[PDB]
Amino acid sequence: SGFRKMAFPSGKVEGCMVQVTCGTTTLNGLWLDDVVYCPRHVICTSEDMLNPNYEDLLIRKSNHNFLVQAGNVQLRVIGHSMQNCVLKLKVDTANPKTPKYKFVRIQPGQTFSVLACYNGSPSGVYQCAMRPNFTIKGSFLNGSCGSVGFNIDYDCVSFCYMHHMELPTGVHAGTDLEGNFYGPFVDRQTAQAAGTDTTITVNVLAWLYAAVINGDRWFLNRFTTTLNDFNLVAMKYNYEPLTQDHVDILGPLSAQTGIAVLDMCASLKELLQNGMNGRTILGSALLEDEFTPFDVVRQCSGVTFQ
Amino acid sequence: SGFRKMAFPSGKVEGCMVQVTCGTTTLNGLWLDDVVYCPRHVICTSEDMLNPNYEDLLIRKSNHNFLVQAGNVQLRVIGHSMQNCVLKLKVDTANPKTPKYKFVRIQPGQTFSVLACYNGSPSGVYQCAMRPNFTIKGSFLNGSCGSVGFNIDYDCVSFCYMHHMELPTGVHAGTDLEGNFYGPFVDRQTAQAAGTDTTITVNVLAWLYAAVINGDRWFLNRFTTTLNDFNLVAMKYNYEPLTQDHVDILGPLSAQTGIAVLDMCASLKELLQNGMNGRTILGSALLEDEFTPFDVVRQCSGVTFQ
Ligand SMILES: *CC(=O)N(CCC(N)=O)NC(=O)[C@H](CC(C)C)NC(=O)OCc1ccccc1
Ligand SMILES: *CC(=O)N(CCC(N)=O)NC(=O)[C@H](CC(C)C)NC(=O)OCc1ccccc1
Numbered sequence A, B: 001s002g003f004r005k006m007a008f009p010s011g012k013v014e015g016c017m018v019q020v021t022c023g024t025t026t027l028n029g030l031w032l033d034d035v036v037y038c039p040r041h042v043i044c045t046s047e048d049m050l051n052p053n054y055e056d057l058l059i060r061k062s063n064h065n066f067l068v069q070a071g072n073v074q075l076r077v078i079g080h081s082m083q084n085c086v087l088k089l090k091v092d093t094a095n096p097k098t099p100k101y102k103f104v105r106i107q108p109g110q111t112f113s114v115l116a117c118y119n120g121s122p123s124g125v126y127q128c129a130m131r132p133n134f135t136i137k138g139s140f141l142n143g144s145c146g147s148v149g150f151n152i153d154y155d156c157v158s159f160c161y162m163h164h165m166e167l168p169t170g171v172h173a174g175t176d177l178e179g180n181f182y183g184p185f186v187d188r189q190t191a192q193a194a195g196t197d198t199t200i201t202v203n204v205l206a207w208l209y210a211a212v213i214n215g216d217r218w219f220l221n222r223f224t225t226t227l228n229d230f231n232l233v234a235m236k237y238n239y240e241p242l243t244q245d246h247v248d249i250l251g252p253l254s255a256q257t258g259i260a261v262l263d264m265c266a267s268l269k270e271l272l273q274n275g276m277n278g279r280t281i282l283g284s285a286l287l288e289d290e291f292t293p294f295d296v297v298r299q300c301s302g303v304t305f306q
Helices: A054-058 A201-213 A227-234 A243-249 A251-257 A263-274 A293-299 B054-059 B201-215 B228-235 B244-249 B251-257 B261-274 B294-301
Strands: A015-023 A025-032 A035-039 A067-070 A074-075 A077-083 A086-090 A101-103 A110-118 A121-129 A150-152 A156-166 A174-175 B016-024 B025-032 B035-038 B067-070 B072-074 B077-083 B084-090 B100-101 B111-118 B119-129 B148-153 B156-166 B172-175
Touching: A015 A035, A025 A067, A035 A156, A035 A243, A054 A077, A054 A263, A110 A156, A121 B294, A156 B077, A201 A243, A201 A251, A201 A263, A201 A293, A227 A263, A243 A251, A251 A263, A251 A293, B016 B035, B016 B119, B035 B156, B054 B077, B111 B156, B201 B244, B201 B251, B201 B261, B201 B294, B228 B261, B244 B251, B251 B261
Parallel strands: A101 A156, B100 B156
Antiparallel strands: A015 A025, A015 A067, A025 A035, A035 A086, A067 A074, A077 A086, A110 A121, A110 A150, A150 A156, A156 A174, B016 B025, B016 B067, B025 B035, B035 B084, B067 B072, B077 B084, B111 B119, B111 B148, B148 B156, B156 B172
16 A cells, blocks of 8 residues: 555666766766667767757767766767767767667657756656656756656666756656657757646546555545546647547556546545545545556556566 | 755665575565575464474574575575574675665664665665664565665765564554664564554654745744743643754754754644644645654755765
8 A cells, every 4th residue: 555656676777777978068978789878968068068060070080089987887889879868979888787778759748757866977867757748847956967767668678868958937848768858959058948738637646546555545536527527628628639548547546446437536636626625535635647557556566577 | 955855876776685484485685795684584484473482493404495586586595694583695696786775773763765775676765764663664565674774975875774574553563783673573463452652743843844944934924932831732732742852963954944943842842732724734744753954954955966
């Protein structure tokens, strides 16, 4: 019992983290097989980072301009290439600690684990989600660029995120591991706004299901609602619409608890219109939307990874 | 910027987790050097678990009754011993991945990271606190017993918690790595109650400082307060008293933000009396008390560990 923002265990990723240095710019990189992936703005100077031309800065570079270093043992660069916003640095030695891995692009509403790193060394691990506006609400200081986000599937690390920048509201933007940004953001220091964010409805229902599996029931009601009449309330409250696919993913949670998905929508509806009245749900005074149905099942059935 | 429940990277502890089996009881253990640490109730049978006589049960056991396995290789047990509620299984092989470590007893209010494990395999990592009533609000299913909590200091792991049991309210109890429970709980399945919990005042103030460092200022005011008049209010709201050692530890955070500790106390005082009016602080509609001053500094200056 209990429920927490649980991250995947981070050991497999820790063994991949390295430090990439170009000029006076130092960020974190990811070393898989004989490639180190990092953000391309490592080749920028603090006076190039306004309107850089990356192809143009890169062609003026040699393999020996990249000090890549794993712990204390450094790494000889023997090739380099740009893939969108990511640099791929071929080094002369394959990472022994390389896990079974893959690169994937996730959608808004999915969650993943972040290993925040500084100078190639892990600092901490936390969970979060791809917001519907393709920001993530992370915790990132200067030099965290190059930190990755990931999910674990038994033995297989699925890298989905690399960190590039903070936005002015204080949220974060980045790319997948093929270098394409999530959202309309670019790797320069200019005026970019996050865009309007919405609450991930399917996740809020799943966390209401986690509440019931853990004994919280004060928010249930006899009430039901149609899918259409619920979406009417949800749009009023800036919640993303609920589709039949969402209803279907919540099946297992509906059947484990005996509470029909549309009944739980009637509960969510009544919580939006009334608030909470000082009650909490799973130690929160807010409706949480950064738990997927998968997260809930995992943290309510004991799914491990090795 | 940003602020989240950040856990220590868990790789050093993952390399230590193993499966211990006695009879049909399987739980997790900690293999450090040639010793495997687990909860002693592994030697119980599901009919022993009401009023066990642990030493009586342990003298009826041989080394070969203990199936200890690290991945697929098993470890031969070549000695056994009881240290309070922890069983010490001496194995014929020293763990190669044994990090620098130590065993520490933590105080209420301090935090640590939990690596929830099942059958020796890490499932997830999360941050929490020793409540003032010596419970922890974990996320723990059947078979999570033997999971450890820890802090990291540069290279050294500090083991402070081994998981033993869930209480009826759904919170969790356990021991340090020398086997002594935190709190008045015993490793048997009888009527045990958590006791009344208080809020960790010093941590709430540290999280208020985290909010200021991250741009949340709305709850500040011109008011100030004496230490005594603040305590008069916090005790009314079931908050733990504020001492000068608390004031002292919040020194750096005070100085870095420019806000005296007693000014921030006055701000907390008003938050207790008025609530939040739907406002939020660091994404939370509650006053958060599972962040110590050290946690805030770490996350707000990017301390790393290697
Ligand atoms: C490289 C790095 O660590 N970044 C992460 C910064 C934070 N706080 O998340 N990214 C940048 O420093 C980035 C460099 C550009 C893309 C060449 N710039 C950026 O994010 O702009 C705003 C900013 C920068 C640093 C700290 C706060 C905000
Ligand atoms: C080791 C283990 O699996 N336990 C953790 C169980 C949870 N959910 O924390 N501990 C026990 O099963 C424990 C065994 C006793 C101490 C010999 N019993 C216990 O915690 O009592 C209530 C309970 C048991 C299992 C699941 C929920 C609650």
